[PDB]
Ligand binder design. Structure first.
Ligand code: HEC
Ligand code: HEC
Ligand code: HEC
Ligand code: HEC
Ligand code: HEC
Ligand code: HEC
Ligand code: HEC
Ligand code: HEC
Ligand code: HEC
Ligand code: HEC
Ligand SMILES: [Ca+2]
Ligand SMILES: [Ca+2]
Ligand SMILES: [Ca+2]
Ligand SMILES: [Ca+2]
Ligand SMILES: [Ca+2]
Length: 626
């Protein structure tokens, strides 16, 4: 019923001794919410300033108590009192005061569902606006990866709440420096030491965050202490990833008995630059060059000719001969039928037109300076309906590089394993038709690269390594816009290899409709759970009408097994015969499905599934049935 619960602390009065704190609660339509039964001041705190506990030391939140004692004022406002405020007798009205207010998800008496809500607000010692703050990060950055509104590890859903409990005082009281939040947060994302009573090595977190400070530390003229990540070096925080130094013993570093001198040597400019230098340099290299690609079909040979034009940052022609010795790889993959690929993985046309500065004999650089290549595999154009009139070609490429500069590829046999020696560049996509009519294109309206980049960054070099140059996905291969006129960067090019017939093995669930789900349900569940909205804005259920069979298994003789397309898509996570699927194979067949059968049988029955008579999935709730 209630979609968003907003909370504001509207009044703080110390006239009776302890503070009386009034909270106003509204819904998404700014209407007052009456009847909250689980509202609480989870923490009352005050701010010991930067350096007060010692030179170079951080500011600290000192505890003043908590309260679940409030009156519902029957107008959207609620007033708290404290039964035992400041039991430690440390209250100081010269300090900034903070209140952390939480409302548990649940149902108002009338049965109205109410979602969780959390907030903090800061004041001076009389309830006016605060004079100074410790605002370094905000909850929004975590939501780029962790599902907004769900608990992050435990206890709460917003970082300010974690920060309000995991304080220096908290850590000191337990004799455990590592549980102070500014140590913990880096610890749990970095694999140099394990964490928890379970000794978990953060392998997955490390591979996503990659120690990149800017995924959480965003400079902003909203958070006045945002630059603290580089301006306040301390042994307590810096040791979270730098785990082998003993400052006390003077091992692996000069002896430092306190934090008095860290900033004198570790100046802010240096700390900020050093931790961000590699990603900054890589992003600079990626944006040095681009490509613009065309494809045409020879109406008589029915082969496709792909032409690639390198351009500079201003989009000005660069003759490929001039940078050829620095091109590490350029690869071109062509399939047919962008809505239901027809050639399979084994039947696709593919070539490394360039490897380590050298042109393949099948590719040439023409007099206008473009690379030109003509397909050699049977593209079977027009052999499978109107969609098969269209060939689509994916171009990926890389340039050799060292320490932020492009360099010559001096080793023709360089295998691409050492990713520090080259940079994947912006990939491209080109369409051509046998008929000469406009090309068909795949829907790109349900998932796009912007969603992938929330976790992997915009500079994600997909598949970079021994097997591929690294595909960087950008507006270069956009062919449509959203309702707002923003270019959509689709993943439709990936279908060149991620075909309905699978990838190199029929046991991989390689089709694109299955592969992203399989990889992420297996390895990203700790982050995403069942949150389809992590990737999807919508489900394009109409797209199923353009699909045929999808490969779902390998037979014992290693031949391919296939399912009708809706069943195939759902069963990636809901394996037939497992505890994750109630419908038996017999029942699914009674709904028109083919389950791990022949390609012919699955193709014939592809538009015979009755699943959507009952199932009405939306991204908000994919489990919905009539
Ligand atoms: C906000 C969403 C968070 C997050 C991300 C974490 N916490 Fe807590 N936490 C609390 C207590 C009493 C402990 C045990 C400490 C001990 O071992 O003595 C923890 C522990 C953790 C861990 C494990 C850290 C480790 O190195 O072992 C982690 C990763 C963690 N928390 C994350 C208590 C609280 C709260 C008290 C009201 C609040 C709020 C939070 N935690 C919030 C969060
Ligand atoms: C105050 C207690 C600190 C803290 C928290 C750190 N330092 Fe230093 N440090 C200095 C030099 C010349 C180096 C080597 C530079 C380099 O490797 O490029 C370091 C190294 C570090 C590290 C990184 C350790 C690593 O090998 O990765 C860290 C995390 C670190 N320091 C923290 C020089 C100085 C000083 C000059 C006399 C002073 C004082 C400090 N550092 C103080 C601190
Ligand atoms: C948008 C549809 C995409 C695409 C194309 C990819 N991702 Fe993710 N990803 C996430 C996590 C936690 C992992 C596992 C990391 C690990 O186990 O070390 C992955 C893995 C991948 C890969 C494998 C290569 C790699 O970098 O590990 C690939 C190719 C890939 N993904 C593509 C996390 C997320 C998200 C967090 C909510 C989001 C969103 C995405 N990924 C989105 C996409
Ligand atoms: C992507 C660049 C992330 C951002 C931004 C934040 N987190 Fe994260 N976190 C991320 C991953 C891939 C993982 C590992 C998940 C897994 O299955 O291993 C984590 C892990 C944590 C943890 C430990 C719990 C765990 O699941 O291992 C915590 C406590 C945590 N993250 C907290 C957290 C906070 C508070 C963030 C905002 C400051 C935050 N993370 C951002 C990826 C990313
Ligand atoms: C999210 C997964 C983070 C990443 C990646 C990095 N930092 Fe961080 N840092 C994060 C949080 C939630 C906090 C606590 C903020 C608070 O209000 O308490 C911090 C804190 C720091 C600090 C302490 C600043 C202070 O005033 O004491 C430092 C020095 C710091 N972080 C440094 C730092 C560096 C150098 C990083 C890249 C290697 C980095 N952080 C990444 C969250 C996250
Ligand atoms: C994990 C999120 C880290 C935190 C917290 C801190 N550092 Fe760091 N540090 C980290 C990485 C991944 C690297 C390698 C950077 C590179 O690309 O070379 C470093 C490196 C340093 C260095 C240079 C050491 C070297 O190998 O040449 C220094 C001097 C350094 N870090 C200092 C430093 C300080 C002062 C920190 C607290 C403010 C700090 N680091 C935190 C990862 C992480
Ligand atoms: C052929 C040149 C490919 C293109 C173009 C793309 N991918 Fe790929 N991918 C390919 C192979 C041979 C494999 C391994 C076999 C398998 O099916 O798993 C993959 C694998 C993936 C995975 C899984 C990764 C894992 O660690 O398990 C993902 C998530 C994936 N591929 C995604 C993906 C995307 C988004 C692409 C377009 C940018 C893409 N692939 C293109 C081969 C090829
Ligand atoms: C990113 C890791 C994703 C998550 C999380 C979820 N889905 Fe997804 N989905 C993803 C991709 C790359 C594709 C292929 C798009 C294409 O061009 O083939 C899909 C596809 C679907 C579909 C097919 C309809 C469509 O919109 O294309 C469905 C019905 C679907 N996905 C459902 C679904 C559900 C129910 C999810 C949460 C449990 C979910 N997806 C998460 C990527 C990702
Ligand atoms: C992984 C990306 C999934 C895809 C693809 C599909 N579903 Fe799903 N589903 C997924 C999860 C993680 C869960 C929660 C499991 C649990 O803990 O209970 C679900 C759940 C459902 C349900 C509710 C289960 C029940 O009580 O019956 C339904 C009805 C459901 N899913 C339907 C469904 C359909 C029709 C799908 C294809 C369009 C589909 N799911 C795909 C994960 C994933
Ligand atoms: C009505 C006669 C249905 C038809 C036709 C199909 N499904 Fe179904 N399904 C139905 C119900 C009532 C449920 C349970 C809902 C709940 O909330 O408990 C389901 C469940 C599923 C699931 C989730 C399974 C699980 O998590 O255990 C999936 C993935 C699913 N159904 C898929 C599916 C397919 C592929 C269908 C067409 C072949 C199909 N369903 C038809 C009701 C009905
Ligand atoms: Ca207020
Ligand atoms: Ca909030
Ligand atoms: Ca760690
Ligand atoms: Ca283009
Ligand atoms: Ca039909």
């Amino acid at each position: 019923s209630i979609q968003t619960l907003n909370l504001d602390i509207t009044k703080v009065s110390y006239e009776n001794g302890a503070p009386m704190v009034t909270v106003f609660a509204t819904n998404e339509a700014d209407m007052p919410v009456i009847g909250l039964a689980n509202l609480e001041i989870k923490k009352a705190l005050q701010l010991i300033p930067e350096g007060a506990t010692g030179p170079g030391n951080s500011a600290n939140w000192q505890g003043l108590g908590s309260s679940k004692s409030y009156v519902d004022n029957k107008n959207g406002s609620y007033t708290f009192k404290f039964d035992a405020f400041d039991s430690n007798k440390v209250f100081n009205a010269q300090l900034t005061q903070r209140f952390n207010v939480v409302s548990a998800a649940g149902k108002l008496a009338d049965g109205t569902t109410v979602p969780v809500a959390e907030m903090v607000e800061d004041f001076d010692g009389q309830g006016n606006a605060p004079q100074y703050t410790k605002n370094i990060v905000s909850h929004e950055v975590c939501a780029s990866c962790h599902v907004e509104g769900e608990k992050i590890y435990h206890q709460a859903t917003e970082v300010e709440t974690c920060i309000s409990c995991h304080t220096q005082e908290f850590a000191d009281g337990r004799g455990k420096p590592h549980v102070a939040f500014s140590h913990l947060i880096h610890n749990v994302h970095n694999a140099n030491k394990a964490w928890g009573k379970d000794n978990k090595i953060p392998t997955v977190a490390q591979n996503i965050v990659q120690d990149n400070c800017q995924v959480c530390h965003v400079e902003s003229d909203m958070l006045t202490e945002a630059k603290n990540w580089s301006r306040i070096p301390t042994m307590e925080v810096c040791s979270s990833c730098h785990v082998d130094i003993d400052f006390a013993a003077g091992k692996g570093h000069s002896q430092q008995l306190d934090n008095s001198n860290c900033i004198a040597c570790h100046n802010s400019d240096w700390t900020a630059e050093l931790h961000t230098a590699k990603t900054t340099a890589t992003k600079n290299l990626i944006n040095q060059y681009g490509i613009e690609t065309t494809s045409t079909i020879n109406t008589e040979t029915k082969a496709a000719t792909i032409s690639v034009q390198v351009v500079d940052a201003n989009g000005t022609a660069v003759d490929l001969k001039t940078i050829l010795p620095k091109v590490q790889r350029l690869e071109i993959i062509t399939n047919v039928g962008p809505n239901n690929a027809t050639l399979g993985y084994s039947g696709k046309d593919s070539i490394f037109a360039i490897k380590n500065g050298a042109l393949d004999p099948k590719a040439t650089i023409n007099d206008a300076g473009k690379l030109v290549y003509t397909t050699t595999k049977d593209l079977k154009l027009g052999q499978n309906g109107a969609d098969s009139d269209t060939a689509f070609s994916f171009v990926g490429w890389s340039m050799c590089s060292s320490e932020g500069k492009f360099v010559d590829c001096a080793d023709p046999a360089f295998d691409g394993v050492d990713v520090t020696k080259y940079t994947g560049m912006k990939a491209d996509l080109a369409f051509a038709t046998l008929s000469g009519k406009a090309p068909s294109t795949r829907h790109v309206d349900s998932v796009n690269m912007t969603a992938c980049a929330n976790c992997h960054t915009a500079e994600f070099e997909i598949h970079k390594g021994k097997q591929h140059a690294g595909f960087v996905m950008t507006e270069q291969l956009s062919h449509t816009q959203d309702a707002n006129g923003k270019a959509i960067v689709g993943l439709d090019a990936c279908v060149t290899c991620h075909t309905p017939d699978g990838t190199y093995s029929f046991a991989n669930r390689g089709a694109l409709e299955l592969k992203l789900h399989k990889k992420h349900v297996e390895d990203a569940y700790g982050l995403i759970g069942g949150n389809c909205a992590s990737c999807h804005s919508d489900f394009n259920l109409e797209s199923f009408k353009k699909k045929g069979a999808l490969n779902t298994a390998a037979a014992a003789d290693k031949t391919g097994l296939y399912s009708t397309p809706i069943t195939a898509t759902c069963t990636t996570c809901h394996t037939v015969g497992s505890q994750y699927m109630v419908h038996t194979k017999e029942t699914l067949e009674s709904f028109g499905a083919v389950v791990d059968g022949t390609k012919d049988d699955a193709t014939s029955a592809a538009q015979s599934e009755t699943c959507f008579y009952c199932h009405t999935p939306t991204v908000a709730d994919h489990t919905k049935v009539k």
